[PDB]
Every structure is written in structure tokens, then in C-alpha cells.
């Protein structure tokens, strides 16, 4: 894997290290929790623990988002990955309407 990575086939190293046995050795650091969509509580996971409902709603589709998701650290809004790619391929402002120019506030 550490030869493949030097070669430049980041996908291939992922396929090879799929088959290692000893855990993934999870990293410890800063974690991104989410304010819940109903009771506004900080829930670390896919579903809230009080209302047991969805915690993140799409700012484009207004539907629950569970898989890949993009967000900016400035305006605190996120949504579906494909949806944000489509929205930001053209525009330079927040489809959440807050005026946060995420294209320059999250490209760090």
C-alpha cells in the first residue's frame, strides 16, 4: 500500500488495505456534531435521542440527509453532496440565503 500510494493510485491502496485484519485504528480528534432539526439539541449521530427524528435536513431538497454531505464551517449549513455540487458549480452564494460566500469561507 505504501508503494502504491507513492506511485499515485490512491484508489488501489484503498482496495488493497480493504483486506487487512487489525481494526481501522480510528482517529481521535475534533468531531462534527449536528444541531437537531426539531428540538435543536446537539446530537452526535444520524438520529436524535429525544425526538428520535432526523437531525439534518437538506437545504436544497428539504429532505433528511443520511449519506454523503457537504457543509461549510462559516455559516453552519449543509446538505446533500450531489445537490451542493450542482448548486455551487454556478453560484457563489449560500442556497440557505444567509449570504455566506462558502466558496471562499470553506476552501481552507
Amino acid at each position: 500500500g505504501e508503494i502504491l500510494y507513492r506511485w499515485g493510485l490512491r484508489e488501489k491502496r484503498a482496495e488493497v488495505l480493504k483486506f487487512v485484519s487489525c481494526p481501522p485504528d480510528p482517529h481521535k480528534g475534533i468531531e462534527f456534531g449536528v444541531y437537531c432539526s426539531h428540538c435543536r439539541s446537539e446530537v452526535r449521530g444520524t438520529q436524535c435521542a429525544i425526538c428520535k427524528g432526523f437531525t439534518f435536513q437538506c437545504a436544497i431538497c428539504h429532505v433528511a440527509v443520511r449519506g454523503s454531505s457537504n457543509f461549510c464551517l462559516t455559516c453552519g449549513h449543509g446538505g446533500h453532496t450531489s445537490h451542493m455540487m450542482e448548486w455551487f458549480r454556478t453560484q457563489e452564494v449560500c442556497p440557505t440565503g444567509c449570504g455566506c460566500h462558502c466558496l471562499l469561507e470553506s476552501t481552507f
Binding site: 508503494i3 507513492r6 506511485w7 499515485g8
Partner: protein, 285 residues
């Protein structure tokens, strides 16, 4: 094929090391300047030039990209000039003054256990410095290890904590392996002495998973011995001289998967001495 790069420096180049992928063939000379030149697509462009030393610069060693684009420069002025490339521009980032003599060599730790740019102090010791984050680097030094000063620091490969280890040598006509203890203070574990003259360069071979460790030691006497230990507990380095260099052996570098030991000496020639089936090593250059 071969791509030729013009050094374009007022003094002869004395060091070289390329990027992990390999795009950035750095050059260092005695002109008090070490620069960066891009070599992509068979090119030669002076992408960035640096000048922050006092006298000659003897070494240039790189960093693993997982910790960013970082160099390491050793200079006769008893200082280390770490250079980073931020926002497409190169700029100095750190310095040291912990050595009373010219720093011989600086080599990087293997990335699996953090960042450590260990360097030797050419009086009796070395200087191991691990960045602690947020621009905090702490220097921990040895206490009178080499007789006249270490020359090259070789980094042992990772093993399955972490059991940190490395090897070193100098003009003491011997090579010693230095092991970091659990308390954090390095404690010597073994000593090897076979070089009839001063030892210039010591190289530690990279690992692939086999149960063996190999070390190639150069010396002023011109002996290139591939010290091997067939057991992980024997700690009995069995030397075997491979060639008789006419002059002092200058450098020793190994292959990507521990196949060929590159050597350059006083003959201004490079011999790619690779071993054989019968246990001998015959140059194929």
C-alpha cells in the same frame, strides 16, 4: 531515459533527494543556498530558491506528505533551517542552535509514529527534535555518545507500542545502535566496531515483512559491509564485506524493496552493488 538538470550554482552540489512521488529534485551546495527545482514531464525549472544559511549545506532530506511539504537543511553553522512551501511560495519556518559543531546529517523518522528530524552534533552527541504541534518543536540531545562526533543517522523501519530505534556512526571507527526506552530517555543496546578507519555513512535497509534486518556501513577504509541479523532477538550483526573501495566510501543508499545498495566513493564513480544467489554481491554497472 535520463533527464539532465543544470545545477547553476557557484559551488559544487554535495547533496540530493527527490520527492516521495518525485517532482522536486532539490540541490544543495557550499554556496550557502539550497534550492528547489521541479522535474515533472522531463523538465528543469527553478520553481523556488532559498537562501538562509551561513556557510556550506551538506544535507537535504524530505518529509512524508501526510505531514505536508517540508524540507530539512543541515548547515555548517550548527543550525537546522526547516523550509516549508505555503500558498505556492517557499519560506523559512524554524531554526535551532543546540549543536556546538557543524551538524553532520539529519534524517527523518518513519511517518507511522509521528514527525522526528533526528540530527547529530559533531562533538559527542545528537539532537532529536519532534514537533509537538502549533509550532512547538522540542530538542532532546544525547550525552557524549560518539568519540569525535556522529556522521550519519540511520532510521530503523517500523515494527509491530512502536519500539523506536535507529542507528548511527561517525569517525570513531565504529557503528552503534541506539534504542529509545519506555521512560523516553534513549539507552544504548549494542555496539559494533569493525571499520579500520573513520565511518562516513551508515544506511538502514527498508523492510517488506521478512524476518531480517540489514545495514550497509560505509567507512574511510572503503569497506561496504551488509550487517545482517537473521533473528529478531539474537542481536548478532554478522558482517560480510562486499567490496574493497580504493578510497573512502562516501555514500550508501538502498533500493525501494531492499534490492540494490548504491555506493559512491573517491573514484567519482557510482557502483550499483547488488547481491547474488550465492550470497556474494557483484556490480552490474
Amino acid at each position: 531515459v535520463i533527464n539532465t538538470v543544470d545545477t547553476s550554482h557557484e559551488d559544487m552540489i554535495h547533496d540530493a533527494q527527490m520527492d516521495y512521488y518525485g517532482t522536486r529534485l532539490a540541490t544543495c551546495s557550499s554556496d550557502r543556498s539550497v534550492k528547489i527545482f521541479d522535474v515533472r514531464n522531463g523538465g528543469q525549472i527553478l520553481i523556488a530558491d532559498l537562501r538562509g544559511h551561513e556557510g556550506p549545506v551538506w544535507q537535504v532530506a524530505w518529509a512524508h506528505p501526510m505531514y505536508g511539504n517540508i524540507l530539512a537543511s543541515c548547515s555548517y553553522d550548527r543550525k537546522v533551517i526547516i523550509w516549508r512551501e505555503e500558498n505556492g511560495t517557499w519560506e523559512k519556518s524554524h531554526e535551532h542552535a543546540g549543536h556546538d559543531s557543524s551538524v553532520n546529517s539529519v534524517c527523518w523518522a518513519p511517518h507511522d509514529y509521528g514527525l522526528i528530524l533526528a540530527c547529530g552534533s559533531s562533538d559527542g552527541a545528537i539532537s532529536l527534535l519532534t514537533y509537538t504541534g502549533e509550532g512547538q518543536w522540542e530538542v532532546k540531545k544525547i550525552n557524549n555518545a560518539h568519540t569525535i562526533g556522529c556522521n550519519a543517522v540511520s532510521w530503523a523501519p517500523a515494527v509491530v507500542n512502536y519500539i523506536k530505534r535507529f542507528a548511527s556512526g561517525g569517525c570513531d571507527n565504529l557503528i552503534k545502535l541506539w534504542k529509545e526506552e519506555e521512560d523516553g530517555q534513549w539507552k544504548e543496546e549494542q555496539k559494533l566496531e569493525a571499520h579500520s578507519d573513520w565511518v562516513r555513512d551508515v544506511a538502514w535497509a527498508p523492510s517488506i515483512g521478512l524476518p531480517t534486518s540489514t545495514i550497509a556501513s560505509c567507512s574511510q577504509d572503503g569497506r561496504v559491509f551488509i550487517w545482517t541479523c537473521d533473528d529478531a532477538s539474537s542481536n548478532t550483526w554478522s558482517p560480510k564485506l562486499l567490496h574493497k573501495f580504493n578510497d573512502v566510501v562516501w555514500h550508501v543508499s538502498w533500493s525501494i524493496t531492499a534490492n540494490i545498495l548504491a555506493v559512491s566513493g573517491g573514484d567519482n564513480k557510482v557502483t550499483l552493488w547488488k547481491e547474488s544467489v550465492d550470497g556474494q554481491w557483484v556490480c552490474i554497472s
